[PDB]
Design a binder for this molecule. Structure first.
Ligand SMILES: [Mg+2]
Lengths: 50, 51, 333, 38, 333, 38
């Protein structure tokens, strides 16, 4: 709105709302590939299955 | 530890000494001052005569 | 799937019998047409976009015409009874680890060298009876083989009590020890499972296995613990998946050889078979030869597919129409 | 075929791979429990 | 404690619901006020410095309105029962060292990575009965634990005899073997202990734990000697310590923020909620939407607290007066 | 705790650190004497 505590900018040419607050927004995109899952063996205890 | 037999070449609980009484004259004695638990836990003795 | 051919194989769906060419109204029809002098036979089938015919079967040049039921095209899911070999020990011994290995033989691939080994294991305690062992082992095998994580269904595992002796109780990864409350368990049966299937892209196959036992020490000797014997199978896979994949291949002979290759632009062949209905298969196999020095023949075959209801009403009516119209002695199944 | 090299006299359960000699009993490990001779 | 808010949280204390204004004379009274067309709603509450009227709730702009019966805010102290299971041995094995490792967590820390361990050890004898083992283990538990001269201990150790089966004998560090004269002890109970609480500086926290066992050998194999099963709790913590911390924070959303920082020069804000009684809660969460450019909502909430006499009478009189004046339908508990 | 390692077959008694076997009788050194097992 009026001030921006994330940068320190008192005054606003382009206001987003009028309630004198500031919301940060972040986005990201991630991803993990496993080519072959028969090349990883595993022994898990049976109380971890569910 | 039935698995591992504790011999004389590594423990040395009796040792050859030099004396006038016999050529192959032998000592006797041993003591443990350390235990080494699994996953890196080593305990060492420190004897304070204050105790 | 992809099949092998004797120089051609073409399929026509016999969803109905209309007995003359004028009654070809709805899709899936068939009319076995032949002349009054029985020398050529052909089938007028109703395509989804018009009337089409078959090749003119020379009735003096047929080699065999044998129709099979739906129960000759069902793969029986094989079973294996896991029991305690009483020559070793009728009771579970008080100390040993009782591990059972399941040796699959065609995992992912088509070879016998692409194996897969899953395990189920019970630490046997003092006072454990024979039935308490089967209660703990069919749970420990189900949490390995019938979990919600495995990409393919490996085996279906059942338990048989001594009071029923035929009725199977299903165990899964969610089966708790209070669900199985019976002190008369005498075997653990490990049955094959049907694989997931996509029309024309993923064929129908199975993963065969062998329950192999690990060794336990009775006395001072390591006595292979258990015995695993084959039981006569009870559950059979349906026929409709093998016949849905059989038309998809045989429509490419009379049609476009590629099916979806390059997709902005395909000629969509509309099929007429249901993968959830059982069918019957009739195969008139023949050849062609001309009256000259070319005595070499060109073998062919024609598959007909009609729906099966258990009493074979549509196929025997299809056989009975071909036999009187063409003069061929096809065996009514 | 199952070798036991040593024997241990004890009032407790000594070890799986040894002979438990009490006063008038000779127990050894067999089939998950201590089988007495005689 | 500090809480998370939806841009504000305002708390008002309901001690006695008078009928209207000029009847509010003592500190802590309240009356919900509204108009004849049921447009706005506000609570005129008597602060100890005068009448303080709350924020006006626009009745078209209410998200939810729900109340809490004050038994949904009481913490239950978990009880574990330590018994020798009949699977391993119902009697203590004469040569084995029985060590019980209590695995505590969150100790004088805020995370579960701050773990603490207390113990209890009894080496059994030849004529060792099971009931004398539960007598001797609990005293050895009361020596490693229950020795804090400074503060109250982490857990409470009890003993239940089988002749009583419902009344627990308390075991403390002063308790010797001769004080426990029963011969039928069958379990040890490890109850949680209510941690210290001061108003506005330390919250109501707890130290969770899990009684764990070290392996004894019975038939040459290392087995866990006991089982720790959780039974239903019998002793609960009342609601006095959570609600007084809630008034400590939501009186700083209206009044003084500097709650005892510059210590001679503070504003002494009197608190109305006493920690020696249980308290119901009623929440009203609303918003405000402006005209023609400011459509964004500034969401708010109003919390009301009233003393609970067990029968939920003082809260039901408060909900019964809001539903008449404002017209909302809050569930009377 | 006294660990016996050897078994000796002799008509007379061997040392206290071995087990005595003769004609069908097992004896080992317990309570200062040779005690029969059976
Ligand atoms: Mg893997």
């Amino acid at each position: 709105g009026i001030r921006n505590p994330f940068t320190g900018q008192k005054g606003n040419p382009y206001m987003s709302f009028d309630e004198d607050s500031a919301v940060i927004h972040r986005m990201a995109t991630l991803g993990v590939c496993v080519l072959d899952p028969t090349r990883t063996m595993s022994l898990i205890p049976a109380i971890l299955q569910g | 530890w039935t698995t591992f037999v504790l011999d004389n070449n590594s423990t040395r609980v009796v040792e050859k000494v030099q004396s006038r009484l016999h050529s192959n004259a032998l000592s006797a004695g041993f003591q443990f001052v350390e235990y080494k638990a699994p996953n890196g836990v080593r305990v060492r003795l420190d004897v304070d005569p204050f105790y | 799937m992809v099949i092998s051919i004797n120089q051609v194989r073409q399929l026509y769906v016999a969803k109905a019998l209309k007995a003359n060419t004028a009654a070809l109204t709805t899709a899936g029809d068939i009319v076995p047409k032949a002349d009054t002098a029985k020398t050529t036979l052909y089938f007028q089938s109703m395509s989804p976009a018009g009337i089409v015919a078959s090749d003119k079967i020379n009735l003096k040049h047929v080699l065999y015409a044998k129709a099979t039921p739906s129960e000759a095209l069902a793969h029986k899911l094989v079973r294996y009874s896991v029991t305690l070999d009483a020559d070793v020990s009728a009771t579970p011994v008080a100390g040993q680890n009782y591990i059972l290995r399941l040796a699959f033989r065609q995992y992912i691939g088509l070879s016998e060298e692409d194996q897969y080994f899953k395990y189920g294991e019970v630490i046997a305690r003092s006072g454990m009876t024979a039935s308490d062992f089967y209660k703990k082992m069919a749970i420990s095998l189900a949490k390995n083989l019938e979990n919600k994580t495995e990409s393919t269904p490996l085996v279906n595992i059942y338990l048989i009590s001594a009071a029923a002796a035929s009725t199977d109780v299903p165990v899964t990864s969610a089966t708790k020890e209070s669900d199985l409350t019976a002190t008369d368990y005498n075997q653990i049966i490990i049955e094959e499972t049907e694989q997931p299937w996509v029309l024309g892209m993923m064929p129908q196959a199975f993963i065969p296995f062998t329950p192999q036992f690990l060794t336990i020490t009775v006395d001072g000797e390591d006595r292979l613990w258990g015995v695993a014997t084959v039981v006569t199978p009870t559950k059979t896979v349906p026929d409709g998946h093998l016949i849905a994949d059989l038309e998809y291949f045989c429509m490419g002979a009379r049609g476009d050889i590629y099916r979806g290759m390059g997709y902005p632009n395909i000629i969509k062949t509309t099929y007429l078979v249901d993968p959830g209905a059982v069918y019957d298969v009739l195969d008139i196999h023949y050849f062609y030869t001309g009256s000259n020095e070319s005595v070499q023949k060109s073998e062919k075959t024609i598959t007909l597919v009609a729906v099966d209801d258990g009493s074979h009403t549509a196929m025997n009516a299809l056989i009975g129409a071909i036999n009187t119209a063409s003069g061929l002695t096809i065996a009514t199944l | 075929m199952k070798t036991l090299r040593t024997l241990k006299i004890s009032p407790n359960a000594p070890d799986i791979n040894s002979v438990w000699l009490y006063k008038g009993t000779m127990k050894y490990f067999n089939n998950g429990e201590w089988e007495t001779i005689g």
